[PDB]
Design a protein around this ligand. Structure first.
Ligand SMILES: Cc1cn([C@H]2C[C@H](O)[C@@H](COP(=O)(O)OP(=O)(O)O[C@H]3O[C@H](C)[C@@H](NC=O)[C@H](O)[C@H]3O)O2)c(=O)[nH]c1=O
Ligand SMILES: Cc1cn([C@H]2C[C@H](O)[C@@H](COP(=O)(O)OP(=O)(O)O[C@H]3O[C@H](C)[C@@H](NC=O)[C@H](O)[C@H]3O)O2)c(=O)[nH]c1=O
Ligand SMILES: [Cl-]
Ligand SMILES: [Cl-]
Ligand code: NA
Lengths: 144, 142
């Protein structure tokens, strides 16, 4: 359903779901994305989450300025995105599926498979002060 | 012991081997790098190579302008790099290992494991004319 087109918008504010160009041939397989085109920003940072125990739960934050883009490059994991009003779960289970999380998207990442690797591109360098880490505070900042 | 340190320079001109900041906790591992810091350029493109048959040999050419940065995020592969005078092989077998290929590095990726997934950051959008395919030309240029 959710990642069938190259680009589709979530009900969750600003969140976009992406299907990256894929070449399958005799010699192997290749998926590709272009920054400022398929991923709607230029990254200053990347990180990878891996080796997550069975049923462990990560995230429970929103970012005030940092844009993020998530691709599960091995295995599978599930993501909940929440704009304060609307929330949805998406399953990142193939290398050509990506999800854009604009700033002020409360996100959780969970149900990682044993060999799952989540890749994240980030618009901003790492800054611990960019995080909102409790949900009620996030809700106040989302109010109209 | 090639990726022992945060940073080490290959004998192959301008090639650098990288070990990324890694934080483990009870919920697993996070490794991170920053563009124009640990990785010496900002990408315009990324690509992933996967499901490569074990006998395949990929590359055998160089780029005129495109900078690349390679991390094997799952499984293992080997990389051969050549500046025209020196050649070396490095094994990308862990997610916190990376290698920088500056322009005019004649490169090969091979010995992919069944489960290998190679992630590449590129400084330029895909360009079919960015390739140097004749080794003699490549050496002359260097
Ligand atoms: C992203 C980062 C962390 N650390 C350090 C901070 C923590 O000590 C450790 C784990 O971070 P944390 O507990 O936030 O891991 P998680 O709960 O997995 O959250 C991480 O991944 C999420 C997908 C992101 N988005 C929404 O939740 C988060 O921005 C990202 O942090 O890595 C960096 O040093 N440098 C860094 O660039
Ligand atoms: C990298 C790319 C290819 N294609 C298309 C062009 C080719 O038809 C096919 C695979 O390319 P190719 O035969 O070069 O795969 P390889 O032989 O694996 O070489 C690729 O990976 C290497 C790390 C790089 N350098 C190697 O020393 C190369 O830049 C990169 O091309 O995918 C993109 O559309 N968009 C793209 O971004
Ligand atoms: Cl889904
Ligand atoms: Cl090595
Ligand atoms: Na609260």
């Amino acid at each position: 359903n959710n990642f069938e087109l190259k680009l589709q918008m979530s009900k969750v504010k600003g969140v976009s779901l992406h299907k990256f160009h894929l070449v399958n041939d005799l010699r192997g397989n290749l998926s590709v994305g272009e920054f400022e085109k398929d991923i709607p920003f230029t990254p200053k940072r990347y990180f990878t989450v891996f080796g997550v125990p069975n049923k462990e739960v990560r995230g429970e934050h929103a970012h005030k300025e940092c844009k993020q883009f998530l691709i599960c490059v091995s295995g599978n994991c599930s993501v909940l995105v929440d704009d304060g009003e609307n929330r949805e779960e998406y399953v990142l289970d193939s290398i050509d599926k990506g999800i854009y999380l604009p700033p002020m998207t409360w996100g959780v990442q969970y149900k990682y498979s044993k060999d799952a690797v989540l890749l994240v591109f980030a618009s901003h360098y790492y800054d611990s002060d960019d995080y909102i880490r409790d949900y009620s505070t996030f809700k106040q900042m989302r109010q109209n």
